[PDB]
mmCIF file with all atom_site columns, C-alpha atoms in Angstrom:
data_model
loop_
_atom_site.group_PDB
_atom_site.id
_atom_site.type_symbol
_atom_site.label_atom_id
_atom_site.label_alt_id
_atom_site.label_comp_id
_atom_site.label_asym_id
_atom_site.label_entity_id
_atom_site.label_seq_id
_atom_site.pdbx_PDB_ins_code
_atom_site.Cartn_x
_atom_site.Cartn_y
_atom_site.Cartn_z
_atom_site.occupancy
_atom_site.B_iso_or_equiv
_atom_site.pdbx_formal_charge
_atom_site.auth_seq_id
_atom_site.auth_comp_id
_atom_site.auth_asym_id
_atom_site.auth_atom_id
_atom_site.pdbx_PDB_model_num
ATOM 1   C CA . UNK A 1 1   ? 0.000  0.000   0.000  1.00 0.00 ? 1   UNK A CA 1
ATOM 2   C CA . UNK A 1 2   ? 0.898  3.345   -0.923 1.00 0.00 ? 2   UNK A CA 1
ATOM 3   C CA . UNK A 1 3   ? -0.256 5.689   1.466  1.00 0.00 ? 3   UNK A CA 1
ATOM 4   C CA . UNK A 1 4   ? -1.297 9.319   0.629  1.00 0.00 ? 4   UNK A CA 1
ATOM 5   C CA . UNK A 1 5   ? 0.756  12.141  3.323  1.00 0.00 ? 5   UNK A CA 1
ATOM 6   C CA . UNK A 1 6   ? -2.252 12.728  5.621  1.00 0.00 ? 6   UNK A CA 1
ATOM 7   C CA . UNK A 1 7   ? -3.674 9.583   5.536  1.00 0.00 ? 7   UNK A CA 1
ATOM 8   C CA . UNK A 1 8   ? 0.180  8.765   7.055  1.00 0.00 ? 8   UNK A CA 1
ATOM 9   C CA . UNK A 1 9   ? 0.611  11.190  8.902  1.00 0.00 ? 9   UNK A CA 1
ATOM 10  C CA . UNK A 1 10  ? -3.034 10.277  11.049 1.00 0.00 ? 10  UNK A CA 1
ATOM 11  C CA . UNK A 1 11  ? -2.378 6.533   11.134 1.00 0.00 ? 11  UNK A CA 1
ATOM 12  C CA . UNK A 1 12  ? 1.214  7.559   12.997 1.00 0.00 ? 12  UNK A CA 1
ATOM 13  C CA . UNK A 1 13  ? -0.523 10.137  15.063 1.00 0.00 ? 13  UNK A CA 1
ATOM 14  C CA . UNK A 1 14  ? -2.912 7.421   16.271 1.00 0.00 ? 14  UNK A CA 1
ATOM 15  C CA . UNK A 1 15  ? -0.716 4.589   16.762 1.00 0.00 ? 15  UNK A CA 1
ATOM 16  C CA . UNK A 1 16  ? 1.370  6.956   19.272 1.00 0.00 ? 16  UNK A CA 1
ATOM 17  C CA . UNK A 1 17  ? 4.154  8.084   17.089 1.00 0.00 ? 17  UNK A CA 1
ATOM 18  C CA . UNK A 1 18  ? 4.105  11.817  17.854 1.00 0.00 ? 18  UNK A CA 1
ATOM 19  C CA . UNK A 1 19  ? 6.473  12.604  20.409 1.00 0.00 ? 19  UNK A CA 1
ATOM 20  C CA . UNK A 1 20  ? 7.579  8.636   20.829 1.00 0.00 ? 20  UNK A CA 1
ATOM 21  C CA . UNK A 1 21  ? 11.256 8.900   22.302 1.00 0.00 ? 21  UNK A CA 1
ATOM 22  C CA . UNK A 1 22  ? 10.874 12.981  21.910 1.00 0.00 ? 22  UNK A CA 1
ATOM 23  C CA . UNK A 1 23  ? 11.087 12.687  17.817 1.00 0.00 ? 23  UNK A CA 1
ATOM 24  C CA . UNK A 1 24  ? 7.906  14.728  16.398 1.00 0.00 ? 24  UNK A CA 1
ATOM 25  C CA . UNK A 1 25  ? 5.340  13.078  13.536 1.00 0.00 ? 25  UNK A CA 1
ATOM 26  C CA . UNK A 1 26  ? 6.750  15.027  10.899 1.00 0.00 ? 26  UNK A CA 1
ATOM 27  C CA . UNK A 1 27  ? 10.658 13.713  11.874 1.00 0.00 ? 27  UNK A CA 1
ATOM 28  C CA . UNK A 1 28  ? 8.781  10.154  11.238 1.00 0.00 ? 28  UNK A CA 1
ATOM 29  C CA . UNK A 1 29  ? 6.599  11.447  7.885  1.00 0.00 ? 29  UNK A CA 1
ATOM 30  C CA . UNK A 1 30  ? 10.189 13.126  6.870  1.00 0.00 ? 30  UNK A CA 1
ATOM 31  C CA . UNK A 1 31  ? 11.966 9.676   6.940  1.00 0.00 ? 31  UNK A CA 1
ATOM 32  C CA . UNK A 1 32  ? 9.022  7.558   5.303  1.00 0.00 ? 32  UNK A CA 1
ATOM 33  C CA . UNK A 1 33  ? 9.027  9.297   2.450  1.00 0.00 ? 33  UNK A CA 1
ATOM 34  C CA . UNK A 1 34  ? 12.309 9.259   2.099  1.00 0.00 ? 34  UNK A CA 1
ATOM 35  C CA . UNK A 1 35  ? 13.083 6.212   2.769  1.00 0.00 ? 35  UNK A CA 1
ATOM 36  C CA . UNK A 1 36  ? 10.158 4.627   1.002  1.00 0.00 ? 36  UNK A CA 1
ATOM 37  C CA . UNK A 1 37  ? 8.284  7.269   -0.273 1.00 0.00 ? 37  UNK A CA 1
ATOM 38  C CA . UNK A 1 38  ? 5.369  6.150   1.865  1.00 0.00 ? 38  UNK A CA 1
ATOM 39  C CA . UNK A 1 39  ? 5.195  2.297   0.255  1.00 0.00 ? 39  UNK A CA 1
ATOM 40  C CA . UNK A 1 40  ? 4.584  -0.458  2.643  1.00 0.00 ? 40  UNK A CA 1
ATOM 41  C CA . UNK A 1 41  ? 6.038  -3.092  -0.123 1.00 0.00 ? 41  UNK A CA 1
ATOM 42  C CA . UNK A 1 42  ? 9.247  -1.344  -0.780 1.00 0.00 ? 42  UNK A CA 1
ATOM 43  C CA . UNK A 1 43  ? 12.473 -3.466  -0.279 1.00 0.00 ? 43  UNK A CA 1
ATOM 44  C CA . UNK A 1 44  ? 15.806 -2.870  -1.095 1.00 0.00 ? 44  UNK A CA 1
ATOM 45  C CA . UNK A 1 45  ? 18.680 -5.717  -1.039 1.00 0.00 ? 45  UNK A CA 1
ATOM 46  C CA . UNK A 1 46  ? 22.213 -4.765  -0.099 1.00 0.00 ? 46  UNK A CA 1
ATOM 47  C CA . UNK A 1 47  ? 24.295 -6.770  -2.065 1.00 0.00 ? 47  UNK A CA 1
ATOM 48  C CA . UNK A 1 48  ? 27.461 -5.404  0.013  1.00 0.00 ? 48  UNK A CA 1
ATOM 49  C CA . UNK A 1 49  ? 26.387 -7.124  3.267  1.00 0.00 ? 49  UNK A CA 1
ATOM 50  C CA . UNK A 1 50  ? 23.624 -9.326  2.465  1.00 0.00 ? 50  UNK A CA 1
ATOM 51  C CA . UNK A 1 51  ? 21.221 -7.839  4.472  1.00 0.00 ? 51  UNK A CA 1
ATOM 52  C CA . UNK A 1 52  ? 18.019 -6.420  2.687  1.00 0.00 ? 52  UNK A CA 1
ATOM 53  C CA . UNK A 1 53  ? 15.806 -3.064  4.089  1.00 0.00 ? 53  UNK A CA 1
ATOM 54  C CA . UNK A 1 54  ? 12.061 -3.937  4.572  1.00 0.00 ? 54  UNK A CA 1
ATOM 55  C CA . UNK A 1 55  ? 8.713  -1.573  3.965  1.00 0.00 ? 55  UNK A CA 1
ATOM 56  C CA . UNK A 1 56  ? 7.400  1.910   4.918  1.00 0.00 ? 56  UNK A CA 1
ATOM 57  C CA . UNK A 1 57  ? 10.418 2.799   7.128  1.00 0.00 ? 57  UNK A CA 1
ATOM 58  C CA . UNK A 1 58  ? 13.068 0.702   5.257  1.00 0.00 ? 58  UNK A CA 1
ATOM 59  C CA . UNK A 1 59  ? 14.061 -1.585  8.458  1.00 0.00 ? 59  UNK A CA 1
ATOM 60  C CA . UNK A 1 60  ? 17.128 -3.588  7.954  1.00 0.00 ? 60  UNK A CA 1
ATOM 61  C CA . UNK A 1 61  ? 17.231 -7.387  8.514  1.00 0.00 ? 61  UNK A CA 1
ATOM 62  C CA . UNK A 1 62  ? 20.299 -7.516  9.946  1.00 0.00 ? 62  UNK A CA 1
ATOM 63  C CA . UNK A 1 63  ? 19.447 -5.961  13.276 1.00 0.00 ? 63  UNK A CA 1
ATOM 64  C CA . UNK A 1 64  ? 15.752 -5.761  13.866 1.00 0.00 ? 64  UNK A CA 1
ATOM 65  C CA . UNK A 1 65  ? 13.222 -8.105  11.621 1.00 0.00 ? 65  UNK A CA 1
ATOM 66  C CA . UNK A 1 66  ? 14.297 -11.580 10.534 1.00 0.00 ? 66  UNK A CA 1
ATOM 67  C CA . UNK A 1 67  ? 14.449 -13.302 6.971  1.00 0.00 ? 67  UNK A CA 1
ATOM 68  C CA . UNK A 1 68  ? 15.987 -16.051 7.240  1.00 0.00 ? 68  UNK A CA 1
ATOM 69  C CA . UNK A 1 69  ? 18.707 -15.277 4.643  1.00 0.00 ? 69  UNK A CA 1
ATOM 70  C CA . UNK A 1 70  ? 20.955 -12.336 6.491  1.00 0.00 ? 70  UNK A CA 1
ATOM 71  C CA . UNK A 1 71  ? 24.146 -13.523 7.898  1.00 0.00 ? 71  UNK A CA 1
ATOM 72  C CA . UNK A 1 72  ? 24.471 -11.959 11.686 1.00 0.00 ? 72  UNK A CA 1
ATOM 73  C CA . UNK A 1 73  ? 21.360 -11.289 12.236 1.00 0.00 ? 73  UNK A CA 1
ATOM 74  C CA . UNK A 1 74  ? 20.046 -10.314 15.704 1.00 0.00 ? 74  UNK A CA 1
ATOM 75  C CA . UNK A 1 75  ? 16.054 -9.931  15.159 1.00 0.00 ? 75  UNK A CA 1
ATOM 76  C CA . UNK A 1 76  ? 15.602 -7.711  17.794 1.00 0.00 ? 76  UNK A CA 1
ATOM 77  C CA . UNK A 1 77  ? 11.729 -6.822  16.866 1.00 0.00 ? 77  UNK A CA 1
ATOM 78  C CA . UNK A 1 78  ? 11.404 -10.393 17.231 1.00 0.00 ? 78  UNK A CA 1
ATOM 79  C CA . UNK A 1 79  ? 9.040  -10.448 14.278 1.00 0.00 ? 79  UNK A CA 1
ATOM 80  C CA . UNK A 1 80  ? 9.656  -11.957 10.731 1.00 0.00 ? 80  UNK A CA 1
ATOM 81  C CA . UNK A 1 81  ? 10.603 -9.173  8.206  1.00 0.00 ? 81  UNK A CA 1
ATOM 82  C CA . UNK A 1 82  ? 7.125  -10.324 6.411  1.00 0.00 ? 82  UNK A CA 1
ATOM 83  C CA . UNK A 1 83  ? 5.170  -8.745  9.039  1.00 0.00 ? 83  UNK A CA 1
ATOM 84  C CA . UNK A 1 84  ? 7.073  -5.546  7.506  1.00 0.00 ? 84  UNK A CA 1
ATOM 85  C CA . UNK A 1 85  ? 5.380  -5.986  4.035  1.00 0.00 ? 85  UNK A CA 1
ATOM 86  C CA . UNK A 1 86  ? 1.485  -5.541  5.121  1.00 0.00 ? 86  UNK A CA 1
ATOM 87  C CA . UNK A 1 87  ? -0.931 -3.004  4.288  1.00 0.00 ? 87  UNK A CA 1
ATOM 88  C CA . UNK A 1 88  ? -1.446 -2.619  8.035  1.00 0.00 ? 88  UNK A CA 1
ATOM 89  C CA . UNK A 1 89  ? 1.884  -1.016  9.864  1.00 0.00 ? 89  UNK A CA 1
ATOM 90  C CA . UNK A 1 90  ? 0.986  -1.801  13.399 1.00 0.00 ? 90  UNK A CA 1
ATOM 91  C CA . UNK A 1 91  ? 4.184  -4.000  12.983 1.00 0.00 ? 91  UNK A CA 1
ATOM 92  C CA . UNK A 1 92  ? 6.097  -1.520  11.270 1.00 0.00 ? 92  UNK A CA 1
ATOM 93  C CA . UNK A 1 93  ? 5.675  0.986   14.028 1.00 0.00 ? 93  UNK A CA 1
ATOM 94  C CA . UNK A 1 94  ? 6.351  -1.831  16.891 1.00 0.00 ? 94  UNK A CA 1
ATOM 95  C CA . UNK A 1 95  ? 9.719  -2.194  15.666 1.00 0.00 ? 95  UNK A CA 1
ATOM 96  C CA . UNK A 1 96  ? 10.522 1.426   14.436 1.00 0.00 ? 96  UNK A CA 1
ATOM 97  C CA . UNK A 1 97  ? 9.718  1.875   18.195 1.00 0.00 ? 97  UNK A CA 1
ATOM 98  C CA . UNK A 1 98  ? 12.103 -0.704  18.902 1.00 0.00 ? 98  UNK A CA 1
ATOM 99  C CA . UNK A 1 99  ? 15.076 0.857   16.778 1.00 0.00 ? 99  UNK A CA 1
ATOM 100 C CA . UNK A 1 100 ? 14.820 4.668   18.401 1.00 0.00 ? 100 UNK A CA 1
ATOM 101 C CA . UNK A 1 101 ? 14.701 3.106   22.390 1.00 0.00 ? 101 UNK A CA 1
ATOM 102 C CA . UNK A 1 102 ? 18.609 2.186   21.531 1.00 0.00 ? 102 UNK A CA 1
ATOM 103 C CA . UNK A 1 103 ? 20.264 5.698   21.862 1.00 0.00 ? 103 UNK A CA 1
ATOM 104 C CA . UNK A 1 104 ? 21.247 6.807   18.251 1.00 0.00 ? 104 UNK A CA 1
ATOM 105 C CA . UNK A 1 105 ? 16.848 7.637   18.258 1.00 0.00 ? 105 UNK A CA 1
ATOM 106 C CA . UNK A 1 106 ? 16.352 8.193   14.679 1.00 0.00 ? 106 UNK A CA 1
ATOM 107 C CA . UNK A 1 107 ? 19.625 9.144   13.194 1.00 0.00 ? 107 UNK A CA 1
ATOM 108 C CA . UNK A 1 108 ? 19.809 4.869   13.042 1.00 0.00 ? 108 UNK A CA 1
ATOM 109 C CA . UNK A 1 109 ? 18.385 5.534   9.485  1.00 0.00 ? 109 UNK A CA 1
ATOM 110 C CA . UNK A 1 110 ? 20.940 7.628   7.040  1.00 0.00 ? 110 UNK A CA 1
ATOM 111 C CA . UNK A 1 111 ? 18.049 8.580   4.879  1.00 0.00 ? 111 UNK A CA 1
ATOM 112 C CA . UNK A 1 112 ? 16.540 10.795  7.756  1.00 0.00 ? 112 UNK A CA 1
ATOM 113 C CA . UNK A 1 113 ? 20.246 11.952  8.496  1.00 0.00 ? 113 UNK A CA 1
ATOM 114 C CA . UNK A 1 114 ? 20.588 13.021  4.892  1.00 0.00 ? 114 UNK A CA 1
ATOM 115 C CA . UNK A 1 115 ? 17.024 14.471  4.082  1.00 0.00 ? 115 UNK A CA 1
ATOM 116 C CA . UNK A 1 116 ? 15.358 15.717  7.683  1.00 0.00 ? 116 UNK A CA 1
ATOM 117 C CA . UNK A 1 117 ? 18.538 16.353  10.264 1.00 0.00 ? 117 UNK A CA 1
ATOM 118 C CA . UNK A 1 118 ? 18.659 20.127  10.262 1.00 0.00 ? 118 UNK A CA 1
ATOM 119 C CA . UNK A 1 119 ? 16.090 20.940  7.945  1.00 0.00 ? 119 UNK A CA 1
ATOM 120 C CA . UNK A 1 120 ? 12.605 22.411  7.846  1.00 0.00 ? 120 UNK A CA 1
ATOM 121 C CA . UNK A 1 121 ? 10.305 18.815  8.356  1.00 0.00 ? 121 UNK A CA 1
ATOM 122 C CA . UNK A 1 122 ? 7.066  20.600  9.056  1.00 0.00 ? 122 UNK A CA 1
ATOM 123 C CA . UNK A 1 123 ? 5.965  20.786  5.082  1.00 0.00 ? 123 UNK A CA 1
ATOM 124 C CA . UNK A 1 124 ? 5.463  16.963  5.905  1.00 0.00 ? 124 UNK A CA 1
ATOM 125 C CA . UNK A 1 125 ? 2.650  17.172  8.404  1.00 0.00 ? 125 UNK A CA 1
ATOM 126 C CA . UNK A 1 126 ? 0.813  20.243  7.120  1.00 0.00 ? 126 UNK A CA 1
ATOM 127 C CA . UNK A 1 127 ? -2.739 20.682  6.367  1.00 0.00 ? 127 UNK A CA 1
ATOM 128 C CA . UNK A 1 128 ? -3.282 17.241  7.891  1.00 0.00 ? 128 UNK A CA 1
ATOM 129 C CA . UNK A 1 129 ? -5.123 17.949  11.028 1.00 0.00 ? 129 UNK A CA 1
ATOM 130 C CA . UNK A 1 130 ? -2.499 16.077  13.308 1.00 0.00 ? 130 UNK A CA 1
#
């Protein structure tokens, strides 16, 4: 699924993302459309290491969802990287939870380091009523 910006940006609201770990909803819209332009099915493999980036917020297998196929992986979400693929991103948020309680927060993902860190992010959430 390919969600439309406020549509997002009210799902995240609701499932608790605003504020989650002091990181504001339009910090989280910033880096899902970056990193996946808001697509729930997106994947990306990394040849490099093996390791393969899964859904709306692009989580790596190495780390935090398990494949199956990764070398060193930890699954710290504890949840199969397919849960990452659905339509439904109760998951997706679970575990994006997961990856900002370590203490790098959101700068864990390079895309929000490269398009939100130090930038004007409130575009993102605007006109949504969130």
């Amino acid at each position: 699924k390919v969600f439309e910006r406020c549509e997002l940006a009210r799902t995240l609201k609701r499932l608790g993302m605003d504020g989650y770990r002091g990181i504001s909803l339009a910090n989280w819209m910033c880096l899902a459309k970056w990193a996946s332009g808001y697509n729930t099915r997106a994947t990306n493999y990394n040849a490099g290491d093996r390791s393969t980036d899964y859904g709306i917020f692009q989580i790596n297998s190495r780390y935090w969802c398990n494949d199956g196929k990764t070398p060193g992986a930890v699954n710290a979400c504890h949840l199969s990287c397919s849960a990452l693929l659905q339509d439904n991103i109760a998951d997706a948020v679970a575990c994006a939870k997961r990856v900002v309680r370590d203490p790098q927060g959101i700068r864990a993902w390079v895309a929000w380091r490269n398009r939100c860190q130090n930038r004007d992010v409130r575009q993102y959430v605007q006109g949504c009523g969130v």
